[PDB]
Structure formats: C-alpha cells, structure tokens
Write a protein that binds this ligand. Structure first.
Ligand SMILES: *[C@@H]1O[C@H](CO)[C@@H](O[C@@H]2O[C@H](CO)[C@@H](O[C@@H]3O[C@H](CO[C@H]4O[C@H](CO)[C@@H](O)[C@H](O)[C@@H]4O)[C@@H](O)[C@H](O[C@H]4O[C@H](CO)[C@@H](O)[C@H](O)[C@@H]4O[C@H]4O[C@H](CO)[C@@H](O)[C@H](O)[C@@H]4O[C@H]4O[C@H](CO)[C@@H](O)[C@H](O)[C@@H]4O)[C@@H]3O)[C@H](O)[C@H]2NC(C)=O)[C@H](O)[C@H]1NC(C)=O
Ligand SMILES: *[C@@H]1O[C@H](CO)[C@@H](O[C@@H]2O[C@H](CO)[C@@H](O[C@@H]3O[C@H](CO)[C@@H](O)[C@H](O[C@H]4O[C@H](CO)[C@@H](O)[C@H](O)[C@@H]4O)[C@@H]3O)[C@H](O)[C@H]2NC(C)=O)[C@H](O)[C@H]1NC(C)=O
Ligand SMILES: *[C@@H]1O[C@H](CO)[C@@H](O[C@@H]2O[C@H](CO)[C@@H](O[C@@H]3O[C@H](CO[C@H]4O[C@H](CO)[C@@H](O)[C@H](O)[C@@H]4O)[C@@H](O)[C@H](O)[C@@H]3O)[C@H](O)[C@H]2NC(C)=O)[C@H](O)[C@H]1NC(C)=O
Ligand SMILES: *[C@@H]1O[C@H](CO)[C@@H](O[C@@H]2O[C@H](CO)[C@@H](O[C@@H]3O[C@H](CO)[C@@H](O)[C@H](O)[C@@H]3O)[C@H](O)[C@H]2NC(C)=O)[C@H](O)[C@H]1NC(C)=O
Ligand SMILES: *[C@@H]1O[C@H](CO)[C@@H](O[C@@H]2O[C@H](CO)[C@@H](O[C@@H]3O[C@H](CO)[C@@H](O)[C@H](O)[C@@H]3O)[C@H](O)[C@H]2NC(C)=O)[C@H](O)[C@H]1NC(C)=O
Ligand SMILES: *[C@@H]1O[C@H](CO)[C@@H](O[C@@H]2O[C@H](CO)[C@@H](O[C@@H]3O[C@H](CO)[C@@H](O)[C@H](O)[C@@H]3O)[C@H](O)[C@H]2NC(C)=O)[C@H](O)[C@H]1NC(C)=O
Ligand SMILES: *[C@@H]1O[C@H](CO)[C@@H](O[C@@H]2O[C@H](CO)[C@@H](O[C@@H]3O[C@H](CO)[C@@H](O)[C@H](O)[C@@H]3O)[C@H](O)[C@H]2NC(C)=O)[C@H](O)[C@H]1NC(C)=O
Ligand SMILES: *[C@@H]1O[C@H](CO)[C@@H](O[C@@H]2O[C@H](CO)[C@@H](O)[C@H](O)[C@H]2NC(C)=O)[C@H](O)[C@H]1NC(C)=O
Ligand SMILES: *[C@@H]1O[C@H](CO)[C@@H](O[C@@H]2O[C@H](CO)[C@@H](O)[C@H](O)[C@H]2NC(C)=O)[C@H](O)[C@H]1NC(C)=O
Ligand SMILES: *[C@@H]1O[C@H](CO)[C@@H](O[C@@H]2O[C@H](CO)[C@@H](O)[C@H](O)[C@H]2NC(C)=O)[C@H](O)[C@H]1NC(C)=O
Ligand SMILES: *[C@@H]1O[C@H](CO)[C@@H](O[C@@H]2O[C@H](CO)[C@@H](O)[C@H](O)[C@H]2NC(C)=O)[C@H](O)[C@H]1NC(C)=O
Ligand code: NAG
Ligand code: NAG
Ligand code: NAG
Ligand code: NAG
Ligand code: NAG
Ligand code: NAG
Ligand code: NAG
Ligand code: NAG
Ligand code: NAG
Ligand code: NAG
Ligand code: NAG
Ligand code: NAG
Ligand code: NAG
Lengths: 389, 136, 136, 136
C-alpha cells in the first residue's frame, strides 16, 4: 500500500548499562566480626519479599567474560581488605614517569596489625533505581551462549566473597550436571571454570600440640582432609565431560607448573591464617575411563605463611604471627579452576594443571547468570496511518 | 504492565501485532472495572524511588515528543514516507513475526537517521501553518 | 480536591451542576495565584504510597481513554446520541438535582452497555478518517 | 532541568531567547539517547516528598490550563492581541535581553489583567464552535 513511519512509546527494548550496584547483605551490627562491621557501614538489609518475574519467549546473548558487573565486585572487595587485614609492612611498587633506568622505588607503609576475626557473609548485588537485572535459568547455560528461560529479578542470590585459588570454596552448586565453562577452548590461555553439582567437603585444622616455634638457630604446620570415597565421584564426572570435548586424547592431570607460592599451592584464609596447602596428592593421577588413584582421609599438608603476595595488585605484604591454637575451617568445594597445556608436542594427551589467581575469574563463576540492562522505551516501526495536516 | 513499569505497551517475546492487539483487550477490561520487620522501611523506599523515577521519566519524554508533534501521545503518527532501503519488508511480516527486540536490531543503523527526519518534518508543518496565519 | 486525591472534580453530596460550576471558580483562583517521633517514618511512607498510586492510576486511565478518543482529557465529549430508554430525563433536572452518587445508581444497568457503544464509535471515526487519507 | 524540578524550561540568568533555543538542543540529545547510615531514611523521604509534590503540582496546573485552551501543553499559543500599553517593546529585544526574572517585574502590573482576557477568549471560541455544531 503506502508505508509511513510512526513513533511509539513504552516499547520493550533493552540495552547494557554500566552502573553501580548497592550491596544488600544480612548483617549483625554487634559482633566484632569484620564482615559484619563492613556490611553495617556500607550495605542495606536483604529484601524480605523478592519477586522474580519470568519473561516469555525471550533470548538474550548473555556474554560472561565481557561482563562489567564483575569488574565492580572486584573493586568492592579490595575496599574490604583495606578495612580488614591491615598489613604490618605493605611493600608496594611505585614508578616515576621517566622514559627508557626508570625510577621505580618502593613505598612501604607501617600500620598496626591487630589479629581480627574473619568469616565471609553472603551479599546480594541489587540493581539501582531505574535499571533491572536479567537472569538465565537454563541448567547448562554454556557461558557466553544465549539461553531461553530468561527471568528478571532485582537482587542476585547469596554470594560469598571468599578469596581462594585452585579450588573455589563456599558457594552455589550446579543444578543437575557438572558443567565446564571457558571463554575459548583449544587456545590454552583462558582458564576453564568447572562447577560441581555436589558439595565436596574439606576440613582443615591444627588443634594445639605444636607450640615448637623454631627448629634450630611446628606452629607453622596444618593439614586438611578430603573424603576420597566421595571426591572420586565428582572427579569421575569431570573427566566424563572433558573427554566429550576431546574424545581421542587422554586426560592426564598434573600438579602446577611453577610460579608464585599463591598459585603453585592452594591458598585460603581462616582468621588471618593464610593456609598454603600443597595439592600434589590430589592432581597427580593420570586418567582414562578407569581410575588410577588407589584400591578416605587424604592428608593435604598445609602451612601458615607470613610474607605473602597481595592479590589486589602487585606488591608483597607481611602479617602478624599466627594464633596459638584451634584453627578450624569447615568448608565446601563447589568449583575448580583448571588450565590446559596444548601445543604441537601434545601427542594425544590432555594436561589440566590447576590454575587460578585472577580473582575476577573467581567471581565470574558466580556472576555468570546475571546481566544489568536498562529499559529504552522508544520505538519506530512502519505502518499505514498518516498524520492529517 | 509489560513486566516493568516502562515497556507497558506489551510483554517482550510476543510479536508486535500480537502485543498491540492484546493491549486493547487489556484496555477495555481495566477501564470498565469488572510477618513484618523494621527493615522493611529501607526496602519500602527502594520500591518507591523506582516508581517515582519511572513516572518522572515518563512525563519528561511525554513532553519531549513535542519536537515531533507527538506530544502527550503514546502512539503517534507522522507523515514521513518510509524508505525501502531501511527495512525492505512488508507490513504483514513485520507485525506478525519479528518481535520488538528483533525489530530494534533490524533498524538500529537507521534509528538515528529517522530522528533527524522527524524533526525537519515538524518544522515544515509549523512553518506551513504559519503561512496560513497570514490569511487566517 | 473532592475530599480525596481522586474524585477531584468536586465533593460528594453536591449536585452535578453545582459541583461543576464551583470547579471553575476553584480553577481561576488556583491558577492566578492570589513534637516528633522516629515512627513518623512508617507513616511517612504510607502517606506516600497513597499519593504515588493515585498518580500512577491517573496516568494509566488518562491514557486508556484513547480507546474512546478522549485521551488526556478529564472532560471529553463524544458523538453518540443519548437514548431515552436509559434515563428519560431532561438535562435540567439531571444537573440541578441527582448528585453523582444518585446518578450512578440511575444508569448502573446501562453503564456497561454505553462502554460498548463508545468504542464502536471511535473505530468508525478512525476508519472514516482513513478513507479521507486516500484523497488527502 | 533549570536547577529545580519546576522551572525546567531553562536556567535562570540566561535570556529568554538563549534559554528557549538551548532547550531544543537539550531536547534532541535526551531523546536520541546518545559510607551509609540508618538516618539516610529520613532524608530519603524528604527527597521524595519534594519530587512527588512537584509532579502532583505539575499535573494539576497542566489540567488547569484547560480554562485557556492550553491543556496538556507547556508552550501554548492564543489569539489575544498584545497591547502596546503593557510593555511597548519589540519582540527582538524582549527575547535577546530581559531574562525571565526581569520580564516578570516588567509586566507584573498587567499579569493579573491578561488572565482575565484569556478566559473570555476561550469561552468565545467554545461558543463559536457550538454555533457551527447547529450546521455541522
Ligand atoms: C566456608 O564456610 C564455612 C562455614 O560453612 C566457614 O567455616 C567457618 O570458619 C570460621 C573460621 O575458620 C569459624 O569461626 C570460628 O568459630 C569458632 C567456633 O565458633 C563457635 O563457638 C563460639 C564460641 O563458643 C560461639 O560463639 C559460636 O556461635 C560458634 O558456635 C570461634 O570460636 C572462632 O573464634 C575464635 O577464633 C578466631 C580466629 O581468629 C578469633 O579471632 C576469635 O576471637 C576467637 O578466638 C578465640 O579462640 C581461639 C581458639 O584457639 C583462641 O586461640 C583465641 O585466643 C581466642 O581465645 C579466647 O577466647 C576463647 C573462647 O572462644 C577462650 O577459651 C580463650 O581462653 C581466649 O580467651 C571462629 O569464630 C566458623 O565456626 C566456621 N563455621 C562453621 C559452620 O564451621 C569457612 O571458613 C568458609 N571458608 C572460608 C575460606 O572462609
Ligand atoms: C607434570 O608436569 C611436569 C612438568 O615439569 C612433568 O615433569 C617433567 O617432565 C619432563 C618432560 O618429560 C621431564 O623432562 C625429561 O625427563 C626425562 C625422564 O627423566 C629426562 O631423562 C630428561 O632429561 C634428559 O633430557 C633432556 C632433553 O630432553 C636433557 O637436556 C637433559 O640434560 C637430560 O639428558 C628430561 O628432563 C622432567 O624430568 C619431568 N620432571 C619431573 C620432576 O617429573 C611431569 O612429567 C608431568 N606429569 C605427568 C604425569 O606427566
Ligand atoms: C578460540 O581460540 C582458538 C585457539 O585458542 C583460536 O584458534 C586459532 O585459529 C586461527 C585460525 O585458523 C589459527 O590461525 C592459523 O595459524 C596458522 C599458523 O600460522 C603460521 O603460518 C602462517 C602461514 O601458514 C604464517 O603467516 C604465520 O606467521 C605463522 O608462522 C596459519 O597458517 C593459518 O592460516 C591460520 O591463520 C590459530 O593458530 C588458532 N590458534 C591456535 C592456538 O591454534 C580461535 O580463533 C578462537 N576463536 C575465535 C572465535 O577467535
Ligand atoms: C524456567 O525458569 C523458571 C524460573 O522460576 C523455572 O520455574 C521454577 O521451577 C522450579 C522447578 O525446578 C520450581 O521449584 C519448585 O517450586 C515448587 C513451588 O515453589 C516446589 O513445590 C518444588 O519443591 C520446587 O522447589 C520454582 O518454584 C519455579 N519458579 C517459580 C518462580 O515458581 C522453570 O522451571 C524453568 N523452566 C524449565 C524448563 O526449567
Ligand atoms: C608437595 O608434596 C610433594 C610430595 O610428594 C612434594 O614432592 C616431592 O618433593 C621433593 C622435593 O623436591 C622431591 O624430592 C626430590 O626428588 C628428586 C628426584 O626427582 C631428587 O633429585 C631431589 O634431590 C629431591 O630428593 C620428590 O621427588 C617429590 N615427590 C615426587 C613424587 O616427585 C612437593 O615438592 C611438594 N610441593 C610443595 C609446593 O610443597
Ligand atoms: C597420588 O596421590 C595419592 C594420594 O592419596 C596416592 O595414594 C596413596 O598411595 C599410597 C601408596 O604408597 C598409599 O599408601 C598405602 O598405605 C597402605 C596402608 O598403610 C599400605 O598397606 C600400602 O602399602 C601403601 O603404603 C596411600 O594410602 C594412598 N592414599 C590414600 C588416601 O589412600 C597415590 O599413590 C599417588 N600416585 C602417584 C602415582 O604418585
Ligand atoms: C577422616 O577424617 C574425619 C574428619 O577429618 C575423621 O572424623 C573424626 O573422627 C574422630 C574419631 O572418632 C571424631 O572424634 C570423636 O567425635 C565424637 C563426636 O563428637 C566424640 O564423642 C568422640 O569422643 C571423639 O572425639 C571426630 O569427631 C571426627 N570428625 C568429625 C568432624 O566428626 C575420621 O576419623 C578420619 N578417618 C580415619 C580413618 O581416621
Ligand atoms: C555454546 O557456546 C559456544 C561459544 O562459547 C557457541 O559456539 C559458537 O556458536 C555459533 C552459533 O551457534 C557458531 O557459529 C560458532 O562456530 C560456535 N563456535 C564454537 C567455538 O563452537 C555455541 O553456539 C553455544 N551453544 C549454544 C547452544 O548456543
Ligand atoms: C568434615 O567435618 C564435617 C563436620 O565438621 C563432617 O560432617 C559430618 O560427617 C559425619 C559423618 O562422618 C555425619 O554423621 C555428620 O552428620 C556430619 N555433620 C553434619 C553437621 O551433618 C564431614 O564428614 C567431615 N568431612 C571430612 C572429609 O573430613
Ligand atoms: C585427618 O586425617 C588424618 C589421617 O587419617 C587423621 O589422623 C588419623 O586420626 C585417627 C583418629 O583421630 C587415628 O586413628 C589415625 O591413626 C590418624 N592417622 C595418622 C596417620 O596419624 C586426622 O585425625 C584427620 N583429621 C581429623 C580432624 O579427624
Ligand atoms: C557444605 O556442604 C554441606 C553438605 O555437605 C551443606 O549442608 C547442607 O546445607 C543445606 C542448606 O540449607 C541444608 O539444606 C542441608 O540439609 C545440609 N546438608 C547437610 C548434610 O548438612 C552446607 O550448607 C555446605 N556449606 C555451605 C557454606 O554451603
Ligand atoms: C511462547 O511460545 C509458546 C509456544 O506455543 C506459546 O504457547 C506462548 O504463548 C508464547 N509466549 C507468549 C508470552 O506468547
Ligand atoms: C569411589 O570411591 C567409593 C568409596 O569411597 C567407591 O564406592 C566407588 O566405587 C569409587 N568410584 C569408582 C569409579 O571406583
Ligand atoms: C584407555 O581406555 C581405552 C578403552 O576405554 C583403551 O582402548 C586405551 O588403550 C586406554 N589407554 C591407554 C593408554 O591404555
Ligand atoms: C529514501 O527515499 C528517498 C526518496 O525521496 C530517496 O531519495 C533516498 O535516497 C532514500 N534513502 C536512502 C538512504 O536510500
Ligand atoms: C513468519 O516467518 C516465516 C519464516 O520463518 C514465514 O514462513 C511466515 O510466513 C511468516 N509469517 C507470516 C504470517 O507471514
Ligand atoms: C548496522 O549495525 C550493525 C550492528 O548491529 C553492524 O554490524 C552493521 O555493520 C551496521 N550497518 C551499517 C550499514 O552501518
Ligand atoms: C436507543 O435508540 C436507538 C435509536 O437509534 C434504538 O434503535 C435503540 O433500541 C435504543 N436502545 C434501547 C436499549 O432501547
Ligand atoms: C428537583 O426535584 C424536585 C422534586 O423533588 C422538583 O420539584 C424540582 O423542580 C427539581 N429541581 C429543579 C431545578 O427542577
Ligand atoms: C438494574 O440494577 C438494579 C440493581 O443493580 C436492579 O435492581 C434492577 O432491576 C436493574 N434493572 C435492569 C433493567 O436491569
Ligand atoms: C489594548 O488595546 C485595545 C484595542 O482593542 C484597547 O481598546 C485597550 O484600551 C488597550 N488596553 C489598555 C490598557 O490601554
Ligand atoms: C511607546 O510606543 C510608541 C509608539 O510605537 C513609541 O514611539 C515610544 O518610543 C514607546 N515608548 C516606550 C517608553 O516604549
Ligand atoms: C540589549 O540592550 C542594550 C541596551 O542595554 C541594547 O543596546 C542592545 O541593542 C540590546 N540587544 C539587542 C540584541 O538589541
Ligand atoms: C506596578 O507594580 C509596581 C510594584 O509591584 C509599582 O511600583 C508600580 O507603580 C505599578 N505600576 C502600575 C502602572 O500599576
């Protein structure tokens, strides 16, 4: 006939926003716990009546490695560690704008070091006034692939700010099957995030019994235990998924390939105790469709350290000596960070060494379901009307 | 009404024709008329700032459509002819298929150009109206 | 203004003619321009949710009157002839006697039928306008 | 937009012509789209009551302009001739010089008289429209 342009208003159209999100955690405001002190001064109470509006037949390209929301959580946690664990000596680099002998002299800071309590708390990132947060609901989701069961919410689920390497601690589990996520496979640079569907437990202690400070002119020793009869089940499903990506090659796990002590070993915290657990008797086994472990209590030898390398930028640190005794960590294991060793020398093998260290990758495994979008209401479409003039 | 305060013309996922036709059914119906905690206060305000901002944005854009002669109307109509180099599609398949999210990516290249054509057409209607004021 | 946020056309109890004539007097006047407790917060919100909901309902029905061609107007006017089997009363006694609460019960039987006639008349005006678009 | 919620036509201090021309630039841009404490609650409400009252006053006066036939329009236009005993100034110097605060004191004597002329002109347009209803 005769097409004509018209303008509508209130049209459902989405975009991508780059806003700030206020946190919302269930605090206490009375104890001397660090996270309860931080959550009281900058967080609001949790929403008692949440509403999840399920959308219809919609599809959204949920990219996860280009998510700007995870770039905010990482900057909201660094501001917590500067209020929690004050280092005794904070040695950090500082260069001068001189082209090239560049003047790069260190700048140390001496602060008081009180041994404070330490325990994470689940926080909820909520959308500000005027924006909305989308959420996929597919049981696989694939990572940067578009899903179909998109539903909108206003606040995310419980997210714990646990900082660890090689094994993602406390958090959410998978829905029905162990899925693997990676930005791009076969390029051996991007870390492969593996989410488990069953909580693998871990207990780490040192009661007292080792007040022996030095040896010659132990308090620096601890251990962990993993249920071998339960851990083999979850590992048996990981190799079942990895072989689906490489059917002719051989899955061969291995220890780390070296580097900094916070990467070669596991590293988590419990009341200022910076456990550096040697994980070689957990990834030494080579694999095929059958096992190569043995046949309960895998003694994961750990060690408290004092001079660490900060994860919140370059630069060493030095904390106060450890507590006298009774340090317990009744944790869980929900994820697993694995790298890959490919190449032209790869003679039908698959090496999956433990990686991690980039804390942004620690939270991308948690903030993969969400995305912050805004509502643009204009719209233009052709029609058959005509303005009478 | 379309899962948010804004975007009330219809719910996403449905096609443009099926959503606009369902609005009229929702129009006749809505017009004929046929435990606690002290921290509910903070969330009582966060639920209000989203409603006041959505209303305050509504009234702003409702008045900003006066640049195109579509002031105060959610569904306007202009007199600018629709090019064929923009979409090259019939009015039947655009409204029966291609929901709003799909249609936006279809004309996202020219959605900034069409805004320039609508304003020029408004000044022409205002100037042509002014010429008749010399007579009447 | 009529003891509530809605119902601002006049106060109840007064007749339809006396209320509409008193509104114009209130129109010229308003246009020419001639102890505490912490629990005042909870009631500070309850007094806001009644004002935001009354505004949000106002804008919804103000735009829903586009079905009858009375969009954005609190006092519209149509072209549907008034039947005599509905009220059978003169325009003088309807406005001088019979306040709004009494008039509603007078035509409550046909108030659902008249809504059907107003929509059919709007589509006819839109279709007849479209036929003139073939010429102009 | 003009440093307050109301007074959004422009910022004070700028002349009437420079403010009205700058609004159109702000119109195309906005349309194309190209620590905490518990006592933040009390100030969270005081910032809302100023926004709800400004919107509720906006909708009231927007509908009260129906007395002059300028309902729903922020920039109307009438047909009452401008006297020379009111300002006796050309349309060029009024818009290039004399900002809004200065212009208000210029016609504050007659700003109450002009309101009487606008209402009489509206009733005349309504009565003259009613006479044509006898024919059409
Ligand atoms: C993953 O998630 C899991 C949760 O599912 C996380 O597991 C949590 O880990 C926490 C730390 O690792 C752990 O917290 C500890 O709990 C101890 C037991 O709590 C219970 O008892 C207390 C007291 O009876 C109850 O109030 C409470 O409700 C519980 O029922 C606490 O006792 C611990 O506090 C002590 O340790 C911290 C360590 O820095 C000290 O800062 C703190 O001040 C306390 O220190 C005293 O005790 C130590 C023990 O040796 C002494 O050495 C020290 O000098 C202090 O001693 C004084 O006080 C004692 C009395 O307590 C007195 O006898 C002595 O003479 C001194 O006067 C600490 O709070 C959580 O329980 C644990 N949760 C679960 C469910 O297991 C896990 O960490 C997460 N993963 C990661 C990586 O975070
Ligand atoms: C887990 O990863 C580690 C990565 O370090 C890997 O351990 C090393 O693997 C390399 C690759 O085979 C080993 O290197 C060779 O090992 C043979 C066997 O002992 C040596 O004889 C070789 O030394 C001779 O050859 C060199 C040239 O090839 C000469 O330059 C040299 O002078 C010698 O003449 C060569 O070193 C390496 O020994 C191991 N190291 C250890 C500690 O294991 C490990 O194999 C991976 N795990 C699994 C299960 O694959
Ligand atoms: C996801 O990651 C994958 C790996 O992590 C990416 O795969 C890459 O894909 C490209 C496209 O084929 C490969 O590039 C090839 O490289 C060879 C070797 O180059 C050498 O020889 C050429 C001449 O032959 C010479 O000019 C060069 O200088 C080199 O000396 C080329 O011969 C091919 O023509 C082709 O360009 C990459 O090798 C491959 N990466 C790896 C690690 O194998 C993949 O692209 C990623 N996905 C997306 C969507 O980007
Ligand atoms: C698409 O996404 C929606 C998101 O809500 C999914 O709906 C949810 O489905 C689960 C089942 O896996 C429901 O959990 C069940 O809830 C009922 C009632 O609360 C309870 O009886 C069960 O024990 C179980 O907990 C969940 O409630 C439901 N969401 C809502 C808001 O009701 C839906 O399943 C997804 N579609 C597919 C095909 O997965
Ligand atoms: C984590 O624990 C494992 C426990 O096996 C440690 O592996 C063992 O480390 C020692 C120290 O280097 C190795 O001994 C060396 O063996 C070579 C022969 O390859 C010999 O030439 C050296 O003189 C030295 O005796 C030992 O072989 C190695 N165990 C195995 C099975 O290879 C590992 O070092 C610990 N890692 C961390 C970071 O704590
Ligand atoms: C990779 O690491 C695992 C860590 O569990 C190794 O499994 C461990 O293998 C040793 C072999 O010497 C087992 O010791 C055995 O103890 C029994 C009872 O005392 C004794 O009768 C045997 O003669 C032997 O000494 C140890 O129990 C077992 N760990 C667990 C938790 O059962 C595995 O061997 C490592 N593989 C390689 C290739 O390094
Ligand atoms: C493998 O590791 C687990 C934990 O790492 C060991 O479980 C622990 O076993 C001891 C010995 O029975 C338990 O102590 C007992 O607890 C009961 C209950 O309170 C108490 O009444 C007894 O007097 C005694 O103290 C200990 O509680 C238990 N750990 C937990 C968390 O329950 C297990 O024994 C290890 N396997 C082997 C073969 O050693
Ligand atoms: C799962 O994710 C991968 C990428 O992470 C998607 O793979 C690409 O999909 C497009 C179209 O589906 C293809 O054109 C590309 O060739 C694929 N690339 C690779 C490397 O596989 C994949 O589509 C996602 N799965 C689903 C169901 O969407
Ligand atoms: C780690 O410790 C937890 C408790 O701190 C253990 O969980 C208990 O396991 C026993 C079985 O041995 C059950 O009877 C208890 O009911 C469990 N506790 C709870 C609260 O349910 C866990 O088994 C330990 N795991 C390892 C590998 O040491
Ligand atoms: C962690 O695992 C070690 C190794 O099995 C446990 O040490 C054993 O403890 C049981 C009972 O306490 C003893 O009968 C064994 O003789 C111990 N083994 C050795 C080699 O000494 C240790 O108890 C576990 N941790 C916890 C908290 O139970
Ligand atoms: C660590 O794992 C244990 C189970 O191994 C979790 O305990 C479960 O917690 C949920 C939460 O409501 C309960 O519904 C289950 O009944 C618990 N099961 C058992 C066996 O105790 C525990 O919550 C996990 N820890 C964290 C921090 O998630
Ligand atoms: C989504 O598609 C199904 C397929 O039959 C349809 O029944 C349903 O109505 C669609 N959703 C909406 C909101 O129209
Ligand atoms: C894993 O270990 C358990 C005992 O802890 C055993 O029952 C199970 O068979 C093992 N898995 C495999 C694949 O052998
Ligand atoms: C791995 O297992 C397959 C059978 O599932 C077997 O054919 C193959 O030889 C095994 N690999 C090695 C290195 O023995
Ligand atoms: C749109 O149609 C006009 C016809 O007047 C034509 O001149 C113009 O080039 C068309 N626009 C484009 C982008 O092709
Ligand atoms: C919608 O698109 C399909 C092509 O995928 C086409 O076959 C169908 O005819 C279209 N619908 C209508 C009503 O024409
Ligand atoms: C239109 O925009 C798309 C992105 O949505 C881009 O890929 C394409 O090249 C653009 N086309 C033109 C003609 O600008
Ligand atoms: C209303 O008047 C019309 C005349 O056009 C008449 O046909 C109709 O029956 C009347 N309605 C009723 C309910 O009597
Ligand atoms: C109002 O009704 C009464 C009957 O109760 C009647 O007498 C009177 O005339 C009516 N008012 C007018 C102005 O006609
Ligand atoms: C009108 O409604 C009233 C009550 O709602 C009822 O008593 C009366 O009989 C009805 N009249 C007709 C004609 O339907
Ligand atoms: C304004 O102009 C009119 C012309 O019709 C004139 O009659 C009237 O007196 C003027 N007003 C004043 C205040 O002089
Ligand atoms: C008033 O108007 C007359 C006629 O245009 C003009 O000559 C005179 O300058 C004006 N006076 C003032 C004070 O504006
Ligand atoms: C503004 O007023 C000055 C006198 O103060 C005058 O000279 C100037 O011409 C006026 N501006 C314009 C644009 O006429
Ligand atoms: C106008 O009002 C001002 C003060 O508002 C007064 O000084 C002035 O004399 C008045 N002029 C006339 C003509 O009324």
């Amino acid at each position: 006939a005769k097409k004509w342009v018209t303008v509508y208003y209130g049209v459902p159209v989405w975009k991508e926003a780059t806003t700030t999100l206020f946190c919302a955690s269930d605090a206490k405001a009375y104890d001397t716990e660090v996270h309860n002190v931080w959550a009281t001064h900058a967080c609001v109470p949790t929403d008692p009546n949440p509403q999840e509006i399920v959308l219809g037949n919609v599809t959204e390209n949920f990219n996860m490695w280009k998510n700007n929301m995870v770039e905010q959580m990482h900057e909201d946690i660094i501001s917590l560690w500067d209020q929690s664990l004050k280092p005794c000596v904070k040695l950090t680099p500082l260069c001068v704008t001189l082209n090239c002998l560049i003047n790069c002299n260190t700048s140390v800071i001496t602060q008081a070091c009180p041994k404070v309590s330490f325990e994470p708390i689940p926080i909820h990132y909520c959308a500000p006034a005027g924006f909305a947060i989308l959420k996929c609901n597919s049981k696989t989701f694939n990572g940067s692939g578009p899903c179909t069961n998109v539903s909108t919410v206003q606040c995310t689920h419980g997210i714990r700010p646990v900082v660890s390497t090689q094994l993602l601690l406390n958090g959410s589990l998978a829905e029905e099957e162990i899925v693997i996520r990676s930005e791009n496979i076969t390029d051996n640079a991007k870390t492969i995030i593996v989410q488990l569907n069953e909580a693998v437990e871990i207990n780490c202690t040192r009661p007292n019994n080792n007040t022996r400070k030095s040896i010659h002119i132990n308090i620096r020793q601890a251990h962990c235990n993993i249920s071998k009869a339960r851990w083999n089940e979850t590992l048996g499903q990981i190799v079942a998924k990895l072989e689906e990506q490489f059917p002719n090659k051989t899955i061969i796990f291995n220890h780390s390939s070296g580097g900094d002590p916070e990467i070669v070993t596991h590293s988590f915290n419990c009341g200022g105790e910076f456990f550096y657990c040697n994980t070689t008797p957990l990834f030494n086994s080579t694999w095929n469709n059958t096992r190569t472990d043995d046949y309960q209590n895998i003694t994961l030898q750990c060690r408290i350290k004092q001079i660490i390398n900060m994860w919140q930028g370059v630069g060493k640190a030095m904390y106060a000596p450890p507590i006298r005794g009774q340090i317990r960590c009744s944790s869980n294991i929900t994820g697993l960070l694995l790298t890959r060793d490919g190449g032209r020398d790869q003679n039908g093998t698959e090496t999956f060494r433990p990686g991690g260290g980039n804390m942004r990758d620690n939270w991308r495994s948690e903030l993969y379901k969400y995305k912050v979008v805004k509502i643009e209401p204009l719209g233009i479409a052709p029609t058959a009307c005509k303005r009478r003039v | 009404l379309g899962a948010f305060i804004l975007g009330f013309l219809g719910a996403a996922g449905s096609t443009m024709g099926a959503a606009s036709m369902a609005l009229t059914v929702q129009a006749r119906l809505l017009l004929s008329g046929i435990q606690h905690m002290l921290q509910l206060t903070v969330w009582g305000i966060k639920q209000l700032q989203a409603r006041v901002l959505a209303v305050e944005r509504y009234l702003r854009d409702q008045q900003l459509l006066g640049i195109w002669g579509c002031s105060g109307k959610i569904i306007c109509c202009t007199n600018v002819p629709w090019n064929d180099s923009w979409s090259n599609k019939t009015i039947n398949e655009i409204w029966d298929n291609m929901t709003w999210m799909q249609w936006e990516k279809e004309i996202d290249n020219y959605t900034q150009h069409i805004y320039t054509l609508l304003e020029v057409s408004q000044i022409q209607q205002e100037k042509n109206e002014q010429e008749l004021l010399e007579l009447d």
